[PDB]
Amino acid sequence: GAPATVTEQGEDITSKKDRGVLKIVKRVGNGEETPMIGDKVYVHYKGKLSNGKKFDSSHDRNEPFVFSLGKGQVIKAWDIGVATMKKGEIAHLLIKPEYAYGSAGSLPKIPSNATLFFEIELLDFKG
Ligand SMILES: C=C[C@@H]1[C@H]2CCC[C@@H](C(=O)N3[C@H](C(N)=O)CC[C@@H]13)N2S(=O)(=O)c1cc(Cl)cc(Cl)c1
Numbered sequence: 234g235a236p237a238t239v240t241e242q243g244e245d246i247t248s249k250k251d252r253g254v255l256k257i258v259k260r261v262g263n264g265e266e267t268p269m270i271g272d273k274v275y276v277h278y279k280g281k282l283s284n285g286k287k288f289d290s291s292h293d294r295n296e297p298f299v300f301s302l303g304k305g306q307v308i309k310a311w312d313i314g315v316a317t318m319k320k321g322e323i324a325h326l327l328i329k330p331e332y333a334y335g336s337a338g339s340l341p342k343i344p345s346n347a348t349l350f351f352e353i354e355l356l357d358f359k360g
Contacts, residue, residue, distance in 0.1 A: 236350040238283060239327040246317055247332070254310045255327040259352070262319030268358035270303035274315055276357040281350060288342050297356055308333045310349075318355040326351045 235293070243255030268274050279290045289336045301307045302315060310332035318324055321338045328349045338345040 235325055235352070236283075236327065239325040239350065243325070243327055246313060250336045251331075253332045254313055255317050256302065256314060257325045258322060259325055260321070260323035260354075262322030264319060267316060267319055268302050268350065269360070271315075272302045272317075272360055273299060274302050274358045275299050276315065277354040277356060279352045281297045281318045281351075282344070283350075302358070308349075311353075314351075314355065315355060318353070320355055320357060323352065326353060342345075 239255055239257050243257050245252045245254070246256045247253050274300075277291045277297050279292065280288050282288050300311075303312050305312065307315075308328070310326060310328040313332070314324070314326045314328075326349075328351070328357050330348060333349050334343045334347060336345050338347060343349075
């Protein structure tokens with residue numbers, strides 16, 4: 234399925250080139266501009282664990298997740314990943330635990346050492 238495909242066919246977007254965050258662009262967004270550090274970014278997403286379970290979705294809440302890019306308000310992979318996206322883009326991310334919740338996990342939903350899959354849509358970004 235889509236998690237296997239991004240695992241096997243995604244591009245490494247990490248600065249370290251350690252394959253900790255892999256990406257596939259599913260829908261190309263608008264123009265060339267990506268958000269900048271400190272922008273307010275509006276996204277929709279769905280996340281899955283490696284047991285095949287959906288663990289979260291903003292779509293199901295009927296409103297986007299909003300955060301300030303590049304400030305450590307989210308897992309490292311999200312700061313890195315959303316920074317690569319154009320407005321209107323849909324992407325898949327496959328994230329090793331070192332760029333997510335690590336050995337600690339995040340109870341109750343995220344186990345220790347969890348690889349995460351997301352589908353993410355960048356709705357908008359604003360300074
Ligand atoms: C609104 C939730 C967000 C989501 C969406 C952004 C990615 C990631 C995340 O960085 N988060 C922040 C964090 N600093 O940890 C705050 C809470 C949590 N998650 S997540 O999808 O990985 C996630 C979902 C759920 Cl239901 C629980 C957790 Cl611990 C994480």
